[PDB]
Amino acid sequence: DCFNVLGKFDPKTTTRMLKSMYDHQLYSQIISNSSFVKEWYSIGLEAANLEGNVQTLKNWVEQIESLRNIDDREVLLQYNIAKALIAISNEDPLRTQKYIHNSFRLIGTNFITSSKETTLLKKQNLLMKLHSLY
Amino acid sequence: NMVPLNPNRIIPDETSLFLESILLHQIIGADLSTIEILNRLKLDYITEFKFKNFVIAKGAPIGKSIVSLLLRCKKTLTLDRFIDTLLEDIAVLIKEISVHPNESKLAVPFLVALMYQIVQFRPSATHNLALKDCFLFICDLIRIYHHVLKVPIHESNMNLHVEPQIFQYELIDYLIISYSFDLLEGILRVLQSHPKQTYMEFFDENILKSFEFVYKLALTISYKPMVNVIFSAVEVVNIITSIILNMDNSSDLKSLISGSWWRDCITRLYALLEKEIKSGDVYNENVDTTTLHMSKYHDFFGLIRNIGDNELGGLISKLIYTDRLQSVPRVISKEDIGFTAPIIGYKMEKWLLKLKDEVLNIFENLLMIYGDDATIVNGEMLIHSSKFLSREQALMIERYVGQDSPNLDLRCHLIEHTLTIIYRLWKDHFKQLREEQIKQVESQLIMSLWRFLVCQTETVTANEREMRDHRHLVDSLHDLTIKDQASYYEDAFEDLPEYIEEELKMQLNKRTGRIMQVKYDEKFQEMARTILESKSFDLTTLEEADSLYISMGL
Amino acid sequence: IIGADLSTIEILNRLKLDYITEFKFKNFVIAKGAPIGKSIVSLLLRCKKTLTLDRFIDTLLEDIAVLIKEISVHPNESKLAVPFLVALMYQIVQFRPSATHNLALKD
Amino acid sequence: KGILRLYSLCISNDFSKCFVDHFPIDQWADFSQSETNKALSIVYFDLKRRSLPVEALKYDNKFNIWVYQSPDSSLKNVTSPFDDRYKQLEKLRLLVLLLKYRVNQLSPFKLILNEASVSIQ
């Protein structure tokens, strides 16, 4: 509660805000926290795709593409995740295949990593959107 | 026999015309009007901006700021004055809009649409000082975007195409770079179309160096080439040729130019020309440095040449919300843009034909330029021109004729002109040819000559029937256009006055016979004869020529 | 105008007629959220190379008059635009009232 | 002939916006029985086809799929000096909303196959 209200009332602390709020899976909120800075977009685009409004997803991916050269290691994954969920609600089993394959091409290059490194459940995040994609 | 005065026109003032035209222009392809596109612009990350009584607030209407400046300066300036004033202001604009860390450049291209509409509008007595101001400003703008035309030769195994997938800033800078080179094009051609008097006053070695930077950036030999910039750059080379063939003592501008730079241009022309035409995948990616593949990434007209699908046009409109003053463009899919009818592919076959027209056309032009020799004057012109002649002879006959597609007509008119090129060589330039060169390729030149020396049978027509049969076999597409044209689009294609129905028949006869690889012009064969059958070099003494004579009959 | 800050037509360019979601009279469409302003100047400029001085006058008079009436008879419609348009028409008839004809005036 | 050919050529072609400005015939259109004079009427008809909203109905007089007239001016060759008929009727025919077919109609499948076999015998 307080942590939100401080985020309103800061951006490094607001980074902490969005981080903790995504951590409590409160996507149905973060969609509404500050839909109307860079380390925040993943936080945002996730809930954007997660809840499932065709208009909200549209607006979020719109700001994302409006950036000049994101270039960033992170967002493009969630970006594709969403950018499939336009073709779904507009029915192209070809466009969707193209974008989801491009999702594979991404995930299997950068976020994917070395072999073992001490953990599995930690990677389960990276792997679990993968599973659901299928 | 006087004719009376006619001053009672309600004359539209030239300044007023210019004003209203800019004020409501819509570009070829989009949906929205220029000035109002402008009216949906805010320049944000530069919270104040100002050069010359041209304040703009932070969240201010860019577009209204335009129309303001426009109208106020209207009752100030005359036509040309209004041009140069805009040019300076918009120039300062673009320059800073460029030099800025977090600034997005949405406005820039659209203002470049301005650039065109504007500078094109009336180039009559416009002065090269202003022209060059804009010009240099944009060349070095380009070197501010020199980070484009030298992107690598291919996508490396590690280099990914996983992407924000935006066609936005790609199309952004693509429009930018192109439109900018397109400036280069347009203003430089307004230079060429200015009175000859106002010429050398603009040409300094700065033109050589700046355009040298951009050319090297552009017609890469170690990166991806990029067909549009390929175009633009090479016609600027053509602009050089133009000032050559136009300045009575063009030796002035030639001496201005540097030998190394003539080389770094003509050599890269060779790099261009020994590529190939394959409508098979003109619309995908293949062996590089060999295919001018205009991909959807940059496929529209270009600010002149109405090349085809122009498939980006309305997507220009989709760039602004067309409802709200804004700074960064509206999203577009990189891939929705672009099996139905490859007739667009064949429109383009005609166009890339016009391109290789340009290739041989500039090479002809420089040919005639250098009545005296030079350093890049080396004979590899003879080699490679004859070489292209050979290849579009042999592969001509084995592949491209008979494929019922009207590309062949221009594909052959090409080499029919190269005939003039070589015949120019025979008349003029046979006081340099190196034994080195003649016996490095005794092969291909003799091939070229004998290609019509075996054609000179001159023993085909004799009737209508066989050739009209040839026609029914091949000329299907050519007749599709022939009948569209005779049935749709001509004054002369009705009411033949009884002296041209025979023109129909024999002209179609000659065109179809000239379609099937054989019996080229009597002028062709005798002009080629005056080259080989004349013994000016020891290609053909009888002792080693009668084996070909008998191989023709004789 | 005397007193305000902004340009007349340009005031107009920040107007949208909402509670009447559409109108059409004479090649004069206006979309729902359309740029009334660019719709004004739109009609203006477009009919420019059509009409002449007096002719463009009476034509715009009739058009913008119909516009007033449209903005007139509607329950929930706000009338914001209306008063700006009246000033616009005054300006027009005040600019060049030469050898015109009254019928338009009377209309 | 002239006016017909001109606007025919124009129609389908994206340059609607090329036309929009530089020439409306609002005055000499004069399709109130006032105002050779019966040929700019076909360009007015194709401009109404451009209007297009669904009010147009099914093809009755063998003309185009006509629209509510109370109107519909003439047949596809209003003036037919043997070439104007061609130009107009062709253009108006395009209002309908092949190479292989070309020669087939020039000399006006499976059945076509074996009928070809026997007729060529």
PDB file of all heavy atoms in Angstrom, chain A residues 61-62 65-68 70 76 79 102 105-106, chain B residues 104 160 162-164 166 168-169 328-329 331-332, unseen atoms left out:
ATOM      1  N   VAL A  61       1.995  -2.430 -26.420  1.00  0.00           N
ATOM      2  CA  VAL A  61       2.966  -2.815 -27.489  1.00  0.00           C
ATOM      3  C   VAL A  61       3.205  -1.578 -28.362  1.00  0.00           C
ATOM      4  O   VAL A  61       4.321  -1.441 -28.873  1.00  0.00           O
ATOM      5  CB  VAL A  61       2.512  -4.043 -28.306  1.00  0.00           C
ATOM      6  N   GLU A  62       2.207  -0.702 -28.489  1.00  0.00           N
ATOM      7  CA  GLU A  62       2.346   0.558 -29.262  1.00  0.00           C
ATOM      8  C   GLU A  62       3.465   1.401 -28.640  1.00  0.00           C
ATOM      9  O   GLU A  62       4.419   1.694 -29.366  1.00  0.00           O
ATOM     10  CB  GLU A  62       1.009   1.306 -29.315  1.00  0.00           C
ATOM     11  N   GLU A  65       6.939  -0.251 -29.289  1.00  0.00           N
ATOM     12  CA  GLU A  65       7.489  -0.114 -30.668  1.00  0.00           C
ATOM     13  C   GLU A  65       7.851   1.348 -30.930  1.00  0.00           C
ATOM     14  O   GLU A  65       8.853   1.587 -31.626  1.00  0.00           O
ATOM     15  CB  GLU A  65       6.470  -0.647 -31.676  1.00  0.00           C
ATOM     16  N   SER A  66       7.054   2.282 -30.417  1.00  0.00           N
ATOM     17  CA  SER A  66       7.357   3.733 -30.516  1.00  0.00           C
ATOM     18  C   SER A  66       8.759   4.025 -29.970  1.00  0.00           C
ATOM     19  O   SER A  66       9.339   5.057 -30.391  1.00  0.00           O
ATOM     20  CB  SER A  66       6.308   4.556 -29.814  1.00  0.00           C
ATOM     21  N   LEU A  67       9.275   3.208 -29.031  1.00  0.00           N
ATOM     22  CA  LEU A  67      10.720   3.491 -28.665  1.00  0.00           C
ATOM     23  C   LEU A  67      11.696   3.455 -29.887  1.00  0.00           C
ATOM     24  O   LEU A  67      11.416   2.765 -30.893  1.00  0.00           O
ATOM     25  CB  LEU A  67      11.155   2.546 -27.541  1.00  0.00           C
ATOM     26  N   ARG A  68      12.856   4.151 -29.857  1.00  0.00           N
ATOM     27  CA  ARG A  68      13.684   4.164 -31.057  1.00  0.00           C
ATOM     28  C   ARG A  68      14.391   2.843 -31.288  1.00  0.00           C
ATOM     29  O   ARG A  68      14.130   2.150 -32.275  1.00  0.00           O
ATOM     30  CB  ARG A  68      14.726   5.275 -30.996  1.00  0.00           C
ATOM     31  N   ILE A  70      15.066  -0.029 -28.697  1.00  0.00           N
ATOM     32  CA  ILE A  70      15.085  -0.709 -27.410  1.00  0.00           C
ATOM     33  C   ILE A  70      16.402  -1.437 -27.246  1.00  0.00           C
ATOM     34  O   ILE A  70      17.155  -1.206 -26.296  1.00  0.00           O
ATOM     35  CB  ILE A  70      13.907  -1.685 -27.296  1.00  0.00           C
ATOM     36  N   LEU A  76      12.092  -7.857 -25.491  1.00  0.00           N
ATOM     37  CA  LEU A  76      11.617  -8.390 -26.761  1.00  0.00           C
ATOM     38  C   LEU A  76      10.873  -9.702 -26.581  1.00  0.00           C
ATOM     39  O   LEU A  76       9.935  -9.994 -27.333  1.00  0.00           O
ATOM     40  CB  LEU A  76      12.790  -8.574 -27.714  1.00  0.00           C
ATOM     41  N   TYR A  79       7.522  -8.851 -25.511  1.00  0.00           N
ATOM     42  CA  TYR A  79       6.985  -8.148 -26.661  1.00  0.00           C
ATOM     43  C   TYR A  79       6.361  -9.120 -27.645  1.00  0.00           C
ATOM     44  O   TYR A  79       5.202  -8.966 -28.034  1.00  0.00           O
ATOM     45  CB  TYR A  79       8.084  -7.350 -27.335  1.00  0.00           C
ATOM     46  N   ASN A 102       9.514 -16.732 -33.875  1.00  0.00           N
ATOM     47  CA  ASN A 102      10.495 -15.706 -33.566  1.00  0.00           C
ATOM     48  C   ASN A 102      10.702 -15.612 -32.058  1.00  0.00           C
ATOM     49  O   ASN A 102      11.810 -15.333 -31.584  1.00  0.00           O
ATOM     50  CB  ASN A 102      10.042 -14.383 -34.165  1.00  0.00           C
ATOM     51  N   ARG A 105      13.251 -18.157 -31.386  1.00  0.00           N
ATOM     52  CA  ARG A 105      14.575 -17.697 -31.803  1.00  0.00           C
ATOM     53  C   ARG A 105      15.178 -16.757 -30.775  1.00  0.00           C
ATOM     54  O   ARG A 105      16.383 -16.806 -30.505  1.00  0.00           O
ATOM     55  CB  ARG A 105      14.512 -17.018 -33.166  1.00  0.00           C
ATOM     56  N   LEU A 106      14.358 -15.897 -30.182  1.00  0.00           N
ATOM     57  CA  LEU A 106      14.874 -15.060 -29.112  1.00  0.00           C
ATOM     58  C   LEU A 106      15.252 -15.884 -27.901  1.00  0.00           C
ATOM     59  O   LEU A 106      16.421 -15.928 -27.508  1.00  0.00           O
ATOM     60  CB  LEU A 106      13.865 -13.998 -28.720  1.00  0.00           C
TER      61      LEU A 106
ATOM     62  N   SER B 104      13.539  11.656 -30.464  1.00  0.00           N
ATOM     63  CA  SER B 104      13.082  10.848 -31.580  1.00  0.00           C
ATOM     64  C   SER B 104      12.797  11.763 -32.759  1.00  0.00           C
ATOM     65  O   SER B 104      12.446  12.930 -32.591  1.00  0.00           O
ATOM     66  CB  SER B 104      11.839  10.047 -31.217  1.00  0.00           C
ATOM     67  N   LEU B 160      21.147 -11.588 -34.470  1.00  0.00           N
ATOM     68  CA  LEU B 160      19.803 -12.125 -34.520  1.00  0.00           C
ATOM     69  C   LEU B 160      18.883 -11.218 -35.318  1.00  0.00           C
ATOM     70  O   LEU B 160      19.175 -10.042 -35.541  1.00  0.00           O
ATOM     71  CB  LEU B 160      19.272 -12.273 -33.105  1.00  0.00           C
ATOM     72  N   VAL B 162      15.626 -11.555 -34.101  1.00  0.00           N
ATOM     73  CA  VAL B 162      14.688 -11.268 -33.030  1.00  0.00           C
ATOM     74  C   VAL B 162      14.749  -9.778 -32.759  1.00  0.00           C
ATOM     75  O   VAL B 162      15.815  -9.159 -32.839  1.00  0.00           O
ATOM     76  CB  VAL B 162      15.049 -12.094 -31.792  1.00  0.00           C
ATOM     77  N   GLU B 163      13.609  -9.175 -32.477  1.00  0.00           N
ATOM     78  CA  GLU B 163      13.503  -7.758 -32.770  1.00  0.00           C
ATOM     79  C   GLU B 163      12.413  -7.166 -31.895  1.00  0.00           C
ATOM     80  O   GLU B 163      11.571  -7.900 -31.373  1.00  0.00           O
ATOM     81  CB  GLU B 163      13.181  -7.557 -34.256  1.00  0.00           C
ATOM     82  N   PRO B 164      12.413  -5.847 -31.692  1.00  0.00           N
ATOM     83  CA  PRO B 164      11.175  -5.179 -31.282  1.00  0.00           C
ATOM     84  C   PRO B 164      10.241  -5.176 -32.467  1.00  0.00           C
ATOM     85  O   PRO B 164       9.088  -4.744 -32.393  1.00  0.00           O
ATOM     86  CB  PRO B 164      11.632  -3.767 -30.919  1.00  0.00           C
ATOM     87  N   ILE B 166       9.888  -3.533 -34.859  1.00  0.00           N
ATOM     88  CA  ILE B 166       9.344  -2.287 -35.336  1.00  0.00           C
ATOM     89  C   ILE B 166       9.799  -2.073 -36.756  1.00  0.00           C
ATOM     90  O   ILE B 166      10.979  -2.203 -37.087  1.00  0.00           O
ATOM     91  CB  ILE B 166       9.771  -1.139 -34.418  1.00  0.00           C
ATOM     92  N   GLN B 168       9.000   0.765 -37.395  1.00  0.00           N
ATOM     93  CA  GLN B 168       8.864   2.190 -37.181  1.00  0.00           C
ATOM     94  C   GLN B 168      10.159   2.918 -37.410  1.00  0.00           C
ATOM     95  O   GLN B 168      10.259   3.647 -38.380  1.00  0.00           O
ATOM     96  CB  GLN B 168       8.381   2.507 -35.774  1.00  0.00           C
ATOM     97  N   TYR B 169      11.162   2.703 -36.568  1.00  0.00           N
ATOM     98  CA  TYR B 169      12.370   3.500 -36.703  1.00  0.00           C
ATOM     99  C   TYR B 169      13.190   3.037 -37.877  1.00  0.00           C
ATOM    100  O   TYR B 169      13.971   3.814 -38.427  1.00  0.00           O
ATOM    101  CB  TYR B 169      13.167   3.480 -35.412  1.00  0.00           C
ATOM    102  N   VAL B 328       6.358  10.919 -31.397  1.00  0.00           N
ATOM    103  CA  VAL B 328       6.937   9.654 -31.849  1.00  0.00           C
ATOM    104  C   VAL B 328       5.888   8.909 -32.664  1.00  0.00           C
ATOM    105  O   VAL B 328       4.701   8.928 -32.319  1.00  0.00           O
ATOM    106  CB  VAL B 328       7.441   8.810 -30.667  1.00  0.00           C
ATOM    107  N   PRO B 329       6.268   8.262 -33.754  1.00  0.00           N
ATOM    108  CA  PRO B 329       5.278   7.829 -34.742  1.00  0.00           C
ATOM    109  C   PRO B 329       4.384   6.708 -34.242  1.00  0.00           C
ATOM    110  O   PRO B 329       4.687   6.002 -33.278  1.00  0.00           O
ATOM    111  CB  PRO B 329       6.137   7.359 -35.912  1.00  0.00           C
ATOM    112  N   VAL B 331       2.565   3.100 -34.467  1.00  0.00           N
ATOM    113  CA  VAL B 331       3.168   1.815 -34.778  1.00  0.00           C
ATOM    114  C   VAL B 331       2.696   1.290 -36.129  1.00  0.00           C
ATOM    115  O   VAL B 331       1.613   1.636 -36.616  1.00  0.00           O
ATOM    116  CB  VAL B 331       2.859   0.840 -33.633  1.00  0.00           C
ATOM    117  N   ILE B 332       3.546   0.486 -36.764  1.00  0.00           N
ATOM    118  CA  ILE B 332       3.195  -0.298 -37.941  1.00  0.00           C
ATOM    119  C   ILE B 332       3.846  -1.666 -37.798  1.00  0.00           C
ATOM    120  O   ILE B 332       4.900  -1.795 -37.169  1.00  0.00           O
ATOM    121  CB  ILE B 332       3.655   0.387 -39.238  1.00  0.00           C
TER     122      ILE B 332
END
